[PDB]
Design an enzyme around this catalytic site. Structure first.
Site, PDB file in Angstrom:
ATOM      1  N   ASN A 103      81.876  81.872 -70.243  1.00 47.43           N
ATOM      2  CA  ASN A 103      83.049  81.552 -69.408  1.00 47.43           C
ATOM      3  C   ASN A 103      83.970  80.531 -70.975  1.00 47.43           C
ATOM      4  O   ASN A 103      83.335  80.412 -71.741  1.00 47.43           O
ATOM      5  CB  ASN A 103      82.742  80.657 -68.418  1.00 47.43           C
ATOM      6  CG  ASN A 103      83.975  80.242 -67.536  1.00 47.43           C
ATOM      7  OD1 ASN A 103      85.229  80.889 -67.752  1.00 47.43           O
ATOM      8  ND2 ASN A 103      83.871  79.597 -66.430  1.00 47.43           N
ATOM      9  N   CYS A 105      92.763  82.273 -70.317  1.00 38.13           N
ATOM     10  CA  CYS A 105      91.525  82.870 -70.547  1.00 38.13           C
ATOM     11  C   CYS A 105      91.583  84.015 -71.244  1.00 38.13           C
ATOM     12  O   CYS A 105      90.510  84.413 -71.706  1.00 38.13           O
ATOM     13  CB  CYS A 105      90.926  82.847 -68.952  1.00 38.13           C
ATOM     14  SG  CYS A 105      92.259  83.851 -67.900  1.00 38.13           S
ATOM     15  N   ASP A 138      91.137  87.692 -61.513  1.00 40.12           N
ATOM     16  CA  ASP A 138      92.188  86.767 -61.872  1.00 40.12           C
ATOM     17  C   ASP A 138      91.521  86.009 -63.277  1.00 40.12           C
ATOM     18  O   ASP A 138      92.501  85.101 -63.504  1.00 40.12           O
ATOM     19  CB  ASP A 138      92.553  85.788 -60.740  1.00 40.12           C
ATOM     20  CG  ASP A 138      91.321  85.205 -60.511  1.00 40.12           C
ATOM     21  OD1 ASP A 138      90.022  85.083 -60.937  1.00 40.12           O
ATOM     22  OD2 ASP A 138      91.622  84.255 -59.600  1.00 40.12           O
ATOM     23  N   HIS A 139      90.443  86.436 -63.845  1.00 42.31           N
ATOM     24  CA  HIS A 139      89.808  85.459 -64.890  1.00 42.31           C
ATOM     25  C   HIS A 139      89.031  86.325 -65.728  1.00 42.31           C
ATOM     26  O   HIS A 139      88.286  86.998 -65.485  1.00 42.31           O
ATOM     27  CB  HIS A 139      88.776  84.335 -64.226  1.00 42.31           C
ATOM     28  CG  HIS A 139      88.225  83.495 -65.352  1.00 42.31           C
ATOM     29  ND1 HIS A 139      88.949  82.642 -66.269  1.00 42.31           N
ATOM     30  CD2 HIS A 139      87.072  83.097 -65.438  1.00 42.31           C
ATOM     31  CE1 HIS A 139      88.263  81.950 -67.055  1.00 42.31           C
ATOM     32  NE2 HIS A 139      87.012  82.258 -66.468  1.00 42.31           N
ATOM     33  N   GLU A 192     103.539  77.275 -77.737  1.00 38.80           N
ATOM     34  CA  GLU A 192     104.415  76.994 -78.554  1.00 38.80           C
ATOM     35  C   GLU A 192     105.010  78.164 -79.514  1.00 38.80           C
ATOM     36  O   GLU A 192     104.605  79.417 -79.283  1.00 38.80           O
ATOM     37  CB  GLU A 192     103.884  75.773 -79.636  1.00 38.80           C
ATOM     38  CG  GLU A 192     103.885  74.510 -78.970  1.00 38.80           C
ATOM     39  CD  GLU A 192     103.450  73.519 -79.933  1.00 38.80           C
ATOM     40  OE1 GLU A 192     104.060  73.343 -81.019  1.00 38.80           O
ATOM     41  OE2 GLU A 192     102.393  72.699 -79.602  1.00 38.80           O
ATOM     42  N   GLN A 212      89.432  76.183 -72.469  1.00 42.57           N
ATOM     43  CA  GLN A 212      90.850  76.699 -72.320  1.00 42.57           C
ATOM     44  C   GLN A 212      91.680  75.309 -71.668  1.00 42.57           C
ATOM     45  O   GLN A 212      92.922  75.360 -71.904  1.00 42.57           O
ATOM     46  CB  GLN A 212      91.051  77.812 -71.406  1.00 42.57           C
ATOM     47  CG  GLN A 212      90.615  77.542 -70.104  1.00 42.57           C
ATOM     48  CD  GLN A 212      90.688  78.568 -69.440  1.00 42.57           C
ATOM     49  OE1 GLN A 212      89.870  79.551 -69.296  1.00 42.57           O
ATOM     50  NE2 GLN A 212      91.827  78.844 -68.628  1.00 42.57           N
TER      51      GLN A 212
HETATM   52  O1  LIG Z   1      95.647  88.252 -64.276  1.00 35.39           O
HETATM   53  C1  LIG Z   1      95.251  87.995 -65.261  1.00 35.39           C
HETATM   54  N1  LIG Z   1      96.267  88.686 -65.997  1.00 35.39           N
HETATM   55  C2  LIG Z   1      97.698  89.237 -65.485  1.00 35.39           C
HETATM   56  C3  LIG Z   1      98.703  89.251 -66.471  1.00 35.39           C
HETATM   57  C4  LIG Z   1      99.173  90.471 -67.419  1.00 35.39           C
HETATM   58  C5  LIG Z   1     100.407  90.162 -68.031  1.00 35.39           C
HETATM   59  C6  LIG Z   1     100.812  89.082 -68.266  1.00 35.39           C
HETATM   60  C7  LIG Z   1     100.584  87.813 -67.647  1.00 35.39           C
HETATM   61  C8  LIG Z   1      99.454  88.095 -66.577  1.00 35.39           C
HETATM   62  C9  LIG Z   1      94.237  87.598 -66.059  1.00 35.39           C
HETATM   63  C10 LIG Z   1      92.830  88.053 -65.681  1.00 35.39           C
HETATM   64  C11 LIG Z   1      92.857  89.437 -66.036  1.00 35.39           C
HETATM   65  C12 LIG Z   1      92.755  89.862 -67.478  1.00 35.39           C
HETATM   66  C13 LIG Z   1      92.541  91.208 -67.657  1.00 35.39           C
HETATM   67  C14 LIG Z   1      92.524  92.353 -66.950  1.00 35.39           C
HETATM   68  C15 LIG Z   1      92.468  91.802 -65.443  1.00 35.39           C
HETATM   69  C16 LIG Z   1      92.732  90.496 -64.940  1.00 35.39           C
HETATM   70  N2  LIG Z   1      94.495  86.126 -65.833  1.00 35.39           N
HETATM   71  C17 LIG Z   1      95.058  85.321 -66.864  1.00 35.39           C
HETATM   72  O2  LIG Z   1      95.859  85.811 -67.588  1.00 35.39           O
HETATM   73  C18 LIG Z   1      95.222  83.712 -66.578  1.00 35.39           C
HETATM   74  O3  LIG Z   1      95.586  83.231 -65.465  1.00 35.39           O
HETATM   75  C19 LIG Z   1      94.368  83.127 -65.827  1.00 35.39           C
HETATM   76  C20 LIG Z   1      93.931  81.640 -66.182  1.00 35.39           C
HETATM   77  O4  LIG Z   1      93.582  81.292 -67.349  1.00 35.39           O
HETATM   78  N3  LIG Z   1      93.875  80.654 -65.258  1.00 35.39           N
HETATM   79  C21 LIG Z   1      93.238  79.401 -65.188  1.00 35.39           C
HETATM   80  C22 LIG Z   1      91.741  79.824 -65.063  1.00 35.39           C
HETATM   81  C23 LIG Z   1      91.244  80.513 -63.542  1.00 35.39           C
HETATM   82  C24 LIG Z   1      90.907  79.523 -62.635  1.00 35.39           C
HETATM   83  C25 LIG Z   1      90.666  79.967 -61.212  1.00 35.39           C
HETATM   84  C26 LIG Z   1      90.849  81.307 -61.020  1.00 35.39           C
HETATM   85  O5  LIG Z   1      90.645  81.914 -59.892  1.00 35.39           O
HETATM   86  C27 LIG Z   1      91.151  82.295 -62.068  1.00 35.39           C
HETATM   87  C28 LIG Z   1      91.703  81.716 -63.299  1.00 35.39           C
HETATM   88 NA    NA Z   2     105.351  81.435 -78.069  1.00 34.47          NA
END
Ligand SMILES: O=C(NCc1ccccc1)[C@H](Cc1ccccc1)NC(=O)[C@H]1O[C@@H]1C(=O)NCCc1ccc(O)cc1
Ligand code: NA
Ligand code: NA
Length: 220
Positions: free
Chosen positions: A187, A25, A162-163, A96, A19
């Site tokens: 991953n 992710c 968070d991932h 984009e 990614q």
């Molecule tokens: O929390 C999240 N989504 C909530 C949200 C909801 C609606 C709109 C926006 C956001 C999700 C995880 C999730 C997904 C489904 C169910 C529960 C949780 N994470 C993401 O969408 C990206 O931020 C992640 C990413 O790719 N960051 C870099 C990689 C990284 C590196 C270190 C680390 O500790 C963690 C990740």
């Molecule tokens: Na867009």
């Protein structure tokens, strides 16, 4: 139920992707799960476009490189009626405008299924469905530097994931003394990370890192 499962040996899983520095992710986890279910339906493994999801699935509640959810991605494909292939719509690691072209769609779904927040329910899903989209708590140094073995982080949260990642199987390991069962997880940080891009996450250990708390797969 089977004691060991590896959907990679059935042909369901594409190679590990990267990614980059985009918070996408959730789209890699989503394509992983849809790649599996499209292969289960058609017997054809075709890599799917994460850029398509990053650029186009905002109306479903995703926020591009600032985060998103696998279920929202599955909803987009249903709502959109298609999803372009990786080769037709390659990954740029930036957000984009939408460039979706239905002529290059190679996948579809009819919604999604959320798994009960139970590691036993996730086991059943993995054993009978295919690769399953899940979220984990990946915000620890030990995860970054993981090389081999069953990953267990004492400070991992089961409620603050968070991932997004992809469970392609599960099994047992006696090459290590202090842990045994694991989830086999793909991953999206490239092949250099972990074990060719995969990690063995501790299984049946207080829902370790929340792996069973946000599990789902698409309906095809
Ligand atoms: O929390 C999240 N989504 C909530 C949200 C909801 C609606 C709109 C926006 C956001 C999700 C995880 C999730 C997904 C489904 C169910 C529960 C949780 N994470 C993401 O969408 C990206 O931020 C992640 C990413 O790719 N960051 C870099 C990689 C990284 C590196 C270190 C680390 O500790 C963690 C990740
Ligand atoms: Na867009
Ligand atoms: Na084939």
């Amino acid at each position: 139920a089977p004691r060991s499962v590896d959907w990679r040996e059935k042909g369901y899983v594409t190679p590990v992707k990267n990614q980059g520095q985009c918070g996408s992710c959730w789209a890699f986890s989503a394509t992983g799960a849809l790649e599996g279910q499209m292969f289960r339906k058609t017997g054809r493994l075709i890599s799917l476009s994460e850029q398509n999801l990053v650029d186009c699935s905002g109306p479903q509640g995703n926020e591009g490189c600032n985060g998103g959810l696998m279920d929202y991605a599955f909803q987009y494909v249903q709502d959109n009626g298609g999803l372009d292939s990786e080769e037709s719509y390659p990954y740029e690691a930036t957000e984009e405008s939408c460039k979706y072209n239905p002529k290059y769609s190679v996948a579809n779904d009819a919604g999604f299924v959320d798994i009960p927040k139970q590691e036993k329910a996730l086991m059943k899903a993995v054993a009978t469905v295919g690769p399953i989209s899940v979220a984990i708590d990946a915000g620890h140094e030990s995860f970054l530097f993981y090389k081999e073995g069953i990953y267990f982080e004492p400070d991992c949260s089961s409620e603050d994931m968070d991932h997004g990642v992809l469970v392609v199987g599960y099994g047992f390991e006696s090459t290590e003394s202090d842990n045994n069962k694991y989830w086999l997880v793909k991953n999206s940080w490239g092949e250099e990370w972990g074990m060719g891009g995969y990690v063995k996450m501790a299984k049946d250990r207080r829902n370790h890192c929340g792996i069973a708390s946000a599990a789902s797969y698409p309906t095809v």
